DNA sequence: GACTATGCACG
DNA sequence: CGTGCAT
DNA sequence: AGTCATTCATG
DNA sequence: CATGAAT
C-alpha cells in the first residue's frame, strides 16, 4: 500500500535529482572538451561506427538511432537537432559534422527531418576523438550497461572556446562565444610555458571572439573583463558598404551580421523601419543573398541622409546588437563561472592526462611486444632443438612447459612461440627481427621519457597543438575595434 | 484531451495526471474505466509560481484541469465540489519526471492547497526494474536471489503498468502531506520562483555534485 | 540545355515506372513468404542485428534507422508503423513482432512513436529466417551497393495464409485473410502427398479464416469459391450472448467482433443509434473491455423486442460487415490473382528449393572439411619428413608448392597443413580423426540423398512442417457457419 | 506558401514546383531569387481525372498553382494574363518522383492545356551519380560515386550548379504532339477505370 | 513535414 | 524576446 | 506528439 | 468510408 511524505520534503528531493543531472549532464559543456553530453555521444557514436570524414555519408536517421539506442537516452528531435546545429556553419567556428542536404540557413527555416539528410564527421571532428581507443580518457557504463562511453573526449584542440556554447541550466545558464582556432592555440602554448600568464599578455595571442558570421566586435575593455571574470559585454555591428547608384541615388549594403541574428526577421524589422517611415530617406529593403555571400542592400532616396539612416537602424535594430559572455561550464563536476586561464589551464591539465596515459598505454603494448621479438630471436638459432621439443611434448601445456623447463623461456613467450603458424618456419631472418628489436628499445626510451619528464611531455603538448594549427588555420572572419 | 471515468463518484474515483500522450494512451488502456479517469499533460507543464495568472489561466492544460476537478481555483476553491477522492500523478522514474512533479505540486500547493491539505493528492511510483519488478536497489538484491532497467513508463505495456502502479491492490503510493505550512512556502519559493539568487544558492547548500 | 518530350511519351514512362515499382515493390506480398519487400527488410534487418526473442528488446528508433540506411529507401514512417503493426496482435493471426509500450489498441488510438518503444522479433519470427545463413535463397545488393539483401526469405512456415496481406497498389490491390497455422500446414502436408488435390479436399483440412479476433464467419460457398478463383465475399459477425438484467430487462453482450473494425468507433455509431431512436428500446451503451476482455454491453428497455435490435445493429454497423477476399500476390515477378492451390503449390516449390540449397550447402561443408581431415591424417603419417620440407621452403606459397609437388596435397589441403600452429604437432592420435572421417561421410550420405531422391526430401519437408505445427499451433478463434 | 521572384517579368520568370516542403527549401536557398519563385508540393498531388471539380478547388495545392501563376483555371484560362515564361516540375529521380510528375502534368493538361501546348510546362531532371553523371552512360565516361536517392541528398550549391542554372541544367519541354492520342493516354492512366488502365500495364509494363 | 506550448537564465 | 536541449 | 491531405483498388 | 505503405 501506500507511504506518507512531505510536500517540503518532496519537492526538495526532485528537484535536487533535475536541478543536478540538468546542471552536469545536459545544458553546460564540460571545460576540457567543451562539449554537452549530447554533443559527445554524437561524436563517439558516429566515430565508432566508422562514419567519419573519409568514408561515404550516412542516413541521418541511422545515426540518431545509434545514439539513441546505445548511449543518450533522450528525444530523437533533441538528438538530430543537436548534430544539425554541429553542421552549421554559421553557429559554429569549425563544424563537427558535415550534413548533405537541408540544413537550415542564415534565414532560419527548418531543416529537412533525418529522413532526408545524411551525415558524417566533419575532418576537424577526427581530432577531438584523437588516441580515443587508447585508454586515454575515463569511461563509463551506458544505461543498459552493455556498452562503455567516454565521459570526456581526448580533445586534441581546445574546442570550448573555439566553438563556444550556449547555454541554459537550472540556476546557472552559459555563453561562450566562438574563437579563432590558430589564436586560441597560441593562447595555449604560450601558457604551456608561462603557467602564470596573466590576461594582458593572453590578449596579444587571443584578442577576442571570432564569429563565424564575421562582423565587427567593440570593446577591448569589456572583452578583457570577460577573459578574467567569465561575464562582459561587447558590441557586434554589421559590415557595410556603399554603393553609389544611377541617379544621383546612393545604396547601404550589409555583407556580414552579428552572431545569433536571423537575416530573414532582421531584414522584415528593418522594412519595418522603412515602412512606418521611422527616420526618413528608405527607397526599399531587398534581399540579396544568394547561395554565395550574404547581401542586403538597402535603396535610399533621391536626396536622403544616408550617415542618418545607417545610424538609426544599428540603434533601433540588430544590425547592432550586444553580446554578452557568461562563460559557466563544468569543472570538476560542478558549474564554474570560469574565464580564459580557468579554462585553458583545465585544457592543458587535460592534455597532460591524455599524453600521460596514451603514453603508458603505447609504451605497456611496445614492451610486449619486445619480449616476444627478443624471444623469437633466441628461437631461430634453436629451430630444430625447439621444433623436436614440441614434438616430443604430449599437447600444448606440456610443450610450454618443456620450453621454459628446458630454455628458460617465459609464459609469454613459450605461448607466442607454440602458436606460431608451420609456414613462419620459412621466414628464419634474425636480422629484420634484431631491426625490429631496436626499433622497440627506442620506442620505449622515447616514451619512458615522456612519462618521466614533465618538461619533455609539455613540448610533445606544443608540438602537437601546432600540427593542428598548421593543419586547421584559418583567418580571423570579425574585425576588432576598441 | 481528458478521458472520463464510467460512472460519476466523487468518493472513489481517481485522477491520473500523466506525463505525455503516449504513456496516457497506455494508461488509457491499463486504467480501470470504473473509477479511474486520465489526463495527459502533453510535455513540461507551465510553472504556476513563475508567469502572469493571465497566460496561466490561458494555459491549456491548467484549465482543462480546474474545470474537470469541478471545484474552481484559486480564492473560490471548495473542496467539497471536488470530482474525484484521489488525485494520482504519474510520471517517468526519470528526472525530467522529477520535474514535472515538482511544476503540477506548485500549481495545487498555489491554487489548491485544501486539496492537497487534505491527503488528496498523490504520487504514483512506477518500478524501476524488471528481473517480477522491484522499486529499490534493495528489492532488486532479493529478487536476484531466486534485469531490465526501466528507462521510463514508455516501454511498459498497459498490462504491465496496471499490474504494478494502477491496480490499487498493488501499487504503492505517495501520499503528499504538507507537515508545515511556513517551511512549504519557502521550499517552493526558492526552488520555483521568479527569484534566481536564492536557488542558485540553494543549490549550491543541498546538491552533492560529488 | 533542352530537350523535347511528348506528353504521351513522358507520360508513359514516368506511369510505368511508377506503376511496375508499386507492383512489385511496395503494396503486394511475395507469394513464397507472404511478405512486402518493407516487411521483410525489417525482419532480416532485425535479425542480422541479433535483435531477437531470446534477447533484450532494441530501442524502436535503433531498428528503424538501420533499416532506412541500410535497406529500406523510404520514409520512417512507413517503416515504423509496418514494425508496429506487424505486433498487434488483432491485425496479425500470428505475430512477427515484440513490442514494447503503447504499440496501439482495438480503439485504433495512435502507438507510441519510435523514440518511446522497443522492440525484438518474436520467436515464429525466427522461423521465417531458418537458415538465411546457408545460402538458401537469392540475395540483391540494396540501394547502397554497400550490402546483399535476401529478395525473399526461407519460410519455415506458410506466412501469406497464416497473416494475409492488405492490400492497394496500382491496377491491383490485395486483401488475403488470417489463417489458423495449425490447419494451413495440416493442408500443406496433405498436398505434399497429394500435388494434384482438389479444393473440396483441401477444405477439410482448412475450412476457412482463423481472425485473430476471432467472431462468426458466415457462408462456406463463398469461401469455396474464394480458394477456387481467389475472389469472394463472405459475412463476418461479432460473437454474442444474453444477458438478463433485474426488472425484466435484457443485456446484449459483445465479445468479439469483425476483423479491421475499430472497437470505439463501433461503440460510437451503435450510440447514434440510442441517441436517434433509430430503431426502438435501446437504454444505455457501454464498453466494459478491459486490459483482459472485450465486452460491449447494450442494455435493453423492458419491453423491448430484442430480436428487432440486434437485427438492427448487424445490418446498419460494423456489428456485422462483409469480408471481400480478393488474393493478389508476387509470382514470378509478376501480379497474380490466385486461389489456395497455386498459394500451397507454390509454397511447397519454395521450401523444396530452400531444403536443397540449404543441403547443398551443409554438404559442401562437410566437403571441405572432410577433405582436409584426410590430409591431416596423412601429413601424421609422414609427419618428419613434411616438417622437413616446410624447413626447406622458401616461403609460404613455395611449401604449398612444395606440398603438392612431392605428396600431391591438394592446394585446400596445403593451406590447411602450412597453417597449422606449431603446438599441432604435439598429437599423433589419427583416431580421433578418423571418428570424424567417419561422421563426416555419414553426415554427406544423408545430405546427398536428400539432394538426389526426391520422395526423400518432401519427406524432410513434412517432418519440419509438423515440428513447426507442434510448436507454434493454437485452437481456431473464429467459428464457421453456412 | 509560395517563395516568389524578387521582380515581376512574365518572359523570364520562372515557378518551380518542387516535391517536398524539405527540397522545397533546398530549392528556395538554391535559386535565384530575381526570377525565379518556389512552389513546395507538400504530399502527393491530388488526381484531377478522378476527383470532383468541387475538390479539385478545394485543394491547397491546386489553389495555390490557379492563384500563383494567376491565369484562371479551365475554361476562362488566358495564357496571355500568365505569370511565368518557364513552369519547371522538379521532383527526386526517384519512382514517387515519377508518379507526381504524373499527377501534375493531368491537371495541366486538363485545366491549362494552352500552357502545356505553349512550350511552357518543363521537367528538371537532377543528376543520378557523383563530378556529374544523368546517364548510365555518363557514368562510364565519368569513371575514365554517390548513386543519389532524391533531391534532399543535395546541397543547395549542388543544385543550383546541376539543375537550377539556365546555363548549366538540363530541362525536358512537354509538347503535345498529337492531342488526339496524349488525351487518350491520360484519361486511360490517371481516370476513374480501373481495367483499362491494368490491360494498360500488362500489355505495356515488362516485368521478366 | 510544418505547426503548436512548455522549462530553465539572461540581457 | 530568443537562445538550445529537454518534454 | 497529435493534426492535417493525398495516392492507389475495392465493394 | 477504411484499409496501409508511400510522399
Ligand atoms: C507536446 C508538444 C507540443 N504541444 C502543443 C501544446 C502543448 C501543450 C502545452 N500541451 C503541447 C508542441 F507544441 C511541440 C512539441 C515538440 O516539438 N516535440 N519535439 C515534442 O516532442 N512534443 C511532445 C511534448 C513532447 C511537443
Ligand atoms: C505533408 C504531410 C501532411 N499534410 C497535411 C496537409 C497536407 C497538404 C494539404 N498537402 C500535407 C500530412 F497530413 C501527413 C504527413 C505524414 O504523415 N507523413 N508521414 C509525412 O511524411 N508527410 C509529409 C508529406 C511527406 C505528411
Ligand atoms: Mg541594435
Ligand atoms: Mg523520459
Ligand atoms: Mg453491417
Ligand atoms: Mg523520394
Given at each position: ?13 526532485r528537484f ?6 540538468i546542471?552536469?549532464?545536459?545544458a553546460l559543456?564540460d ?16 566515430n ?12 541521418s536517421a ?24 554541429m ?7 569549425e563544424?563537427?559534422?558535415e ?7 542564415m ?7 533525418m529522413?532526408?539528410?545524411?551525415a558524417?564527421?566533419?575532418?576537424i571532428?577526427g ?11 575515463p ?8 556498452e562503455?562511453?567516454?565521459?570526456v573526449?581526448?580533445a ?9 556554447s550556449t ?38 595571442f ?12 567593440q570593446?577591448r575593455?569589456?572583452?578583457?573583463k ?15 558598404e556603399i554603393?553609389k ?13 552579428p ?16 515602412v ?11 534581399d ?9 542592400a ?17 540603434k ?16 570538476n ?15 592543458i ?5 591524455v ?23 633466441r ?10 621439443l ?25 605461448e ?13 631472418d ?5 631491426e625490429e628489436?631496436?626499433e622497440?628499445?627506442?620506442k620505449?626510451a622515447?616514451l619512458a ?16 597543438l601546432?600540427?593542428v594549427?598548421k593543419?586547421?588555420?584559418?583567418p580571423?572572419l ?5 | ?8 463518484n466523487?468518493a472513489?474515483?481517481?485522477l491520473y ?18 473509477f479511474?479517469?486520465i489526463?495527459?499533460?502533453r ?6 509560481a ?5 497566460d ?7 484549465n482543462?484541469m480546474?474545470?474537470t ?31 514535472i ?8 500547493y498555489?491554487?489548491?492547497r485544501?486539496?492537497?491539505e ?5 504520487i504514483?511510483?512506477?518500478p524501476?526494474?524488471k528481473?517480477?519488478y ?5 528489492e ?12 521510463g ?7 504491465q ?9 498493488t ?15 519557502r521550499?517552493?519559493?526558492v526552488?520555483?520562483?521568479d ?9 549550491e547548500?543541498?546538491?552533492?555534485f560529488?
Open positions: 500500500n501506500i507511504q506518507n511524505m512531505s510536500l517540503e520534503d518532496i519537492m526538495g528531493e535536487g535529482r533535475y536541478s543536478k543531472y546542471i552536469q549532464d545536459r559543456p571545460i576540457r572538451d567543451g562539449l554537452k553530453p549530447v554533443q559527445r555521444r554524437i561524436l563517439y557514436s558516429m565508432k561506427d566508422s562514419n567519419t570524414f573519409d568514408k561515404s555519408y550516412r542516413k541511422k545515426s540518431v538511432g545509434n545514439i539513441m539506442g546505445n548511449f543518450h537516452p533522450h528525444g530523437d528531435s533533441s538528438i538530430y537537432d543537436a548534430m544539425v546545429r553542421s552549421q556553419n554559421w553557429k559554429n567556428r563544424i563537427l559534422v550534413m548533405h542536404g537541408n540544413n537550415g540557413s534565414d532560419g527555416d527548418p531543416p529537412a527531418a529522413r532526408y539528410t545524411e558524417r564527421l566533419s575532418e571532428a581530432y577531438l576523438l584523437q588516441d580515443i581507443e587508447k585508454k586515454t580518457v569511461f563509463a557504463w551506458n544505461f543498459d550497461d552493455t562503455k562511453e567516454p565521459t573526449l581526448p586534441a584542440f581546445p574546442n570550448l572556446l573555439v566553438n563556444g547555454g541554459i541550466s537550472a540556476g546557472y545558464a552559459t555563453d561562450i562565444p566562438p574563437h579563432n582556432l590558430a589564436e586560441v592555440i597560441d593562447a595555449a602554448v604560450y601558457m604551456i610555458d608561462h603557467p602564470t600568464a596573466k590576461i594582458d599578455k593572453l590578449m596579444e587571443l584578442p577576442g571572439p571570432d564569429f563565424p558570421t564575421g562582423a565587427i566586435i570593446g575593455d569589456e572583452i578583457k570577460a577573459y578574467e571574470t567569465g561575464k562582459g559585454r561587447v558590441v557586434v555591428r554589421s559590415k557595410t554603393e547608384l544611377k541617379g544621383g541615388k546612393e545604396q547601404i549594403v550589409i555583407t556580414e551580421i552572431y545569433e541574428i536571423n537575416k530573414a526577421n532582421l531584414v522584415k524589422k528593418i522594412d519595418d523601419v522603412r512606418n517611415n521611422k527616420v526618413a530617406g528608405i527607397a526599399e529593403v531587398r540579396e543573398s544568394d547561395r554565395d555571400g550574404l547581401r542586403i538597402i535603396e535610399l532616396k533621391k536626396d536622403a541622409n544616408t550617415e542618418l539612416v545607417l545610424n538609426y537602424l544599428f533601433y535594430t540588430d544590425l547592432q546588437i550586444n553580446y554578452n559572455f557568461n562563460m559557466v561550464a563544468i569543472d563536476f560542478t558549474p564554474r563561472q570560469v574565464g580564459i586561464v580557468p579554462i585553458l589551464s583545465s585544457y591539465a587535460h592534455r597532460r592526462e599524453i600521460l596515459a596514451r603514453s603508458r598505454f603505447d609504451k605497456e603494448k611496445a614492451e610486449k611486444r619486445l619480449h616476444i621479438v627478443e624471444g623469437l630471436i628461437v631461430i638459432s634453436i629451430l630444430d632443438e625447439v621444433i623436436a614440441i614434438r616430443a611434448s604430449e599437447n600444448k601445456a606440456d610443450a610450454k612447459e618443456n620450453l621454459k623447463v628446458s630454455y628458460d623461456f617465459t609464459e609469454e613467450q613459450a607466442a612461440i607454440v602458436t606460431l603458424q608451420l609456414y613462419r618456419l620459412t621466414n628464419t634474425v636480422v629484420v627481427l634484431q628489436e631496436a622497440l628499445r627506442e620505449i622515447m621519457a615522456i612519462i618521466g619528464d614533465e618538461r619533455t611531455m609539455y613540448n610533445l603538448m606544443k608540438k602537437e601546432r600540427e594549427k593543419k586547421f588555420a584559418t580571423r570579425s574585425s576588432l575595434e576598441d | 484531451k481528458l478521458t472520463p471515468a464510467q460512472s460519476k466523487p472513489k474515483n481517481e495526471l500523466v506525463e505525455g500522450d503516449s504513456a496516457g494512451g497506455s494508461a488509457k488502456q491499463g486504467r480501470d474505466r470504473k479511474q479517469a489526463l495527459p499533460l510535455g513540461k507543464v507551465i510553472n504556476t513563475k508567469a502572469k495568472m493571465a496561466i489561466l490561458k494555459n491549456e492544460e491548467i482543462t480546474i474545470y476537478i469541478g471545484a474552481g481555483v484559486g480564492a473560490d476553491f471548495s473542496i467539497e465540489d471536488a470530482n474525484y477522492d484521489k488525485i494520482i500523478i504519474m510520471t517517468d522514474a526519470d528526472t525530467d519526471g522529477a520535474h512533479q515538482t511544476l503540477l505540486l506548485t500549481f495545487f498555489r491554487y489548491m485544501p486539496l492537497v487534505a491527503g488528496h493528492v498523490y504514483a511510483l512506477p524501476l526494474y528481473m517480477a522491484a522499486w529499490t536497489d534493495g532488486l538484491e532479493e529478487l536476484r536471489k531466486q534485469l531490465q532497467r526501466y528507462k513508463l514508455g516501454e511498459m505495456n498497459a498490462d503498468l496496471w499490474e504494478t502502479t494502477m491496480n490499487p491492490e501499487r504503492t503510493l505517495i501520499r503528499v502531506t504538507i507537515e508545515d505550512l511556513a517551511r512549504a512556502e521550499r517552493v519559493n526552488l520555483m520562483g527569484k534566481v539568487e536564492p536557488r542558485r544558492k540553494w543549490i547548500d543541498n546538491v552533492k560529488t
